[PDB]
Amino acid sequence: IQIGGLFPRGADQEYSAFRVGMVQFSTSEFRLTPHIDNLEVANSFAVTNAFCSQFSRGVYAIFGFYDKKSVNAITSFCGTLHVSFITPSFPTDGTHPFVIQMRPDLKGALLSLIEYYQWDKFAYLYDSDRGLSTLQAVLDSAAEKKWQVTAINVGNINNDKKDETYRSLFQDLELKKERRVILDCERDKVNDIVDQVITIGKHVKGYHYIIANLGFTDGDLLKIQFGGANVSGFQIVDYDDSLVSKFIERWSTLEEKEYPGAHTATIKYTSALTYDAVQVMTEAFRNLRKQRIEISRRGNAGDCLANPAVPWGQGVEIERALKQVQVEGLSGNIKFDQNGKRINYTINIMELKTNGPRKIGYWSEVDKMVVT
Amino acid sequence: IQIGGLFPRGADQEYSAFRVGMVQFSTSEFRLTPHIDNLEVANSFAVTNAFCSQFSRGVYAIFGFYDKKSVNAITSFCGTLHVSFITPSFPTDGTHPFVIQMRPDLKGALLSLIEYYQWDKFAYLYDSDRGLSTLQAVLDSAAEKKWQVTAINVGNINNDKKDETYRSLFQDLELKKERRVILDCERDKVNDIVDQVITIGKHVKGYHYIIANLGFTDGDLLKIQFGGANVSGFQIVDYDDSLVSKFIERWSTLEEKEYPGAHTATIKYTSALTYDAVQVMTEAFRNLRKQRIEISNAGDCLANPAVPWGQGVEIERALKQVQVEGLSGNIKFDQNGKRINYTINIMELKTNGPRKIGYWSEVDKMVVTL
């Protein structure tokens, strides 16, 4: 069963996690065979081309990553042609079809926590790249719950004055005597920022930071474990989980030059979801034999732009099979709604104490109350 | 010289403005011949297909429109393949190449005005559909100049509870006793917002509204000329201008069934820029003979590897170094296709009518009261 892979450049850990999943989840009676393409995922042209190529090859589904600058390109083609796209990238805001979204929604949990700490005046530092879905919720709810949010787009600082203007961003932000802050950026920025918070000595007592992403332990927490600032975040990989322990003991011992990014004690949530994604995909094709469904080409349709666009017949079966999969993985309960969004899922709430990161509770999609 | 046209559906006025420009700007020695495609511009699939169609036809440039949804699709293909795209849609935030952007940047002017009125607590009503480029500029600043902005995305209200929830959005917005307000919506959402403002009687004295777009007179401002509320906005078409008067006399008398959307006293700024766009293109191809530059089988846009059209950059250059006067005044571009050396009239709604109370220069950058 042929599938396509659209991996960003230097998505090493993720590709390794993907290959590991391939080995583990494929069997004798059943083997996925992926054609992998590596590309600049923010380039809509590159992405449209990568898609159209796989479409001629005759793939049945596509595992991939997309970016704010390329998401519409990919979803529009998937939706139009009935190719299902499975992805660990950010969930789409809209109810798009033929997109199975492995990443859970953080908007929900982040708002509950802001209330849990009973904040009502803070700062919000967002990266334009991530998608801006969350900026709005914080703003929408700051109207409702009357918060005084101080939003600043931080994604448009170039390496040139990286350290120079970050430092002077607190000569602009100390103005409102701002103490509680939320970080919503790609890991490279999050680190780049923390580094700067320390350098200027705003990691001391009196400051509280929330890391708006799903991998709290994913990066280097240590550098501020002892400044005296409060530091909170989210984690969808429970390393206390049996399933996850068994995984890491193999992962931590992989040939680091055969599996780049491996041979470590933690795994990035994106890499985790990439691996869980191989499980979901394999299971949905096993359920398509277990319903004696013929999803095979009897013929091949090769142009991405043929007009009129005629959707693949079996396309809708494959979308269904995927969305009605339920398994347990590195991210716990994997279960989808009609729109390919994740449900019945849990996010650990985390605090950075002096001994280390602590799971202080969880956020259920259902209960929805930070449970402690 | 062949060019492509990518028009949204029911972009009537704009297409008419386009055809008019075609007539007057083309000569004996020089004729642009457009292949026109009408499409759902928010559909990146549709838009990419259309682009690729024109690309095979062998067009030299493309005039068109794009949507927050579909802008990356377009710019990405244009950038990659070296086809130049001229457009009246919102300017791109980046420095994308091969995009000549006819619409000036409103971020600049809007911020100056907020200071001119010396506001520091207001509401900002934005439309998701337009793009959130401005939402940031306002918020980035609200940090800097310590404003207390109350932002609300209003683009995700469906026709069902249109009136129902707009009204109850001031049962949520009267909370902060909110009196100054910025509207950043399409004309359609703008007038809908305005009617509701009147229906509930918040168009009275004590309220001040700023209309964040380039067509202050473009819609019906009369409905609230006399409520007693302050109402300000922007205008890039100066109807007092000689060049524009000559235009409207013709425009206002066109066969309304031969030129839909015409036969009126005002013209929408998009239609204006559409028309100005025919001038800019025309000019740039005339300057390409006036430099004895040769440009002339095209191929598949999905050909791999992508090989850029050789003459492509020449055409991008010619376009970007064009300077003329049009319905929007001084048309002049920087290296990035963005507009420069331009002016925006500042406008207030008085009881006799809208009044040009000043201007905003890209250079002076004052709100330059007069």
Swiss-Prot record, chain A:
Induction record: Down-regulated in the pyramidal cell layer of CA1 in the hippocampus by global ischemia.
Tissue/organ expression: Detected in forebrain. Detected in dendrites of neuronal cells. Expressed in the pyramidal cell layers of CA1 and CA3 and in the granule cell layer of the dentate gyrus.
Cellular localization per UniProt: Cell membrane; Postsynaptic cell membrane; Postsynaptic density membrane
Cysteines paired by S-S bonds: 52-304
Domain of life: Eukaryota
Extracellular side: 1-372
Sites where a glycan is attached: 230, 344
Domain notes: The M4 transmembrane segment mediates tetramerization and is required for cell surface expression.
Task performed by this protein: Ionotropic glutamate receptor that functions as a ligand-gated cation channel, gated by L-glutamate and glutamatergic agonists such as alpha-amino-3-hydroxy-5-methyl-4-isoxazolepropionic acid (AMPA), quisqualic acid, and kainic acid. L-glutamate acts as an excitatory neurotransmitter at many synapses in the central nervous system and plays an important role in fast excitatory synaptic transmission.
Note: The postsynaptic actions of L-glutamate are mediated by a variety of receptors that are named according to their selective agonists. This receptor binds AMPA (quisqualate) > L-glutamate > kainate.
UniProt subunit comment: Homotetramer or heterotetramer of pore-forming glutamate receptor subunits. Tetramers may be formed by the dimerization of dimers. May interact with MPP4. Forms a ternary complex with GRIP1 and CSPG4. Interacts with ATAD1 in an ATP-dependent manner. ATAD1-catalyzed ATP hydrolysis disrupts binding to ATAD1 and to GRIP1 and leads to AMPAR complex disassembly. Interacts with GRIP2. Interacts with GRIP1. Interacts with NSF via its C-terminus. Interacts with CACNG2, PICK1 and GRIP2. Interacts with GRIA1 and SYNDIG1. Part of a complex containing GRIA2, NSF and NAPA and/or NAPB.
Name listed for the protein in its UniProt record: Glutamate receptor 2
Source organism of the structure: Rattus norvegicus (Rat)
Residues of the full protein shown: 27 to 398 of 883
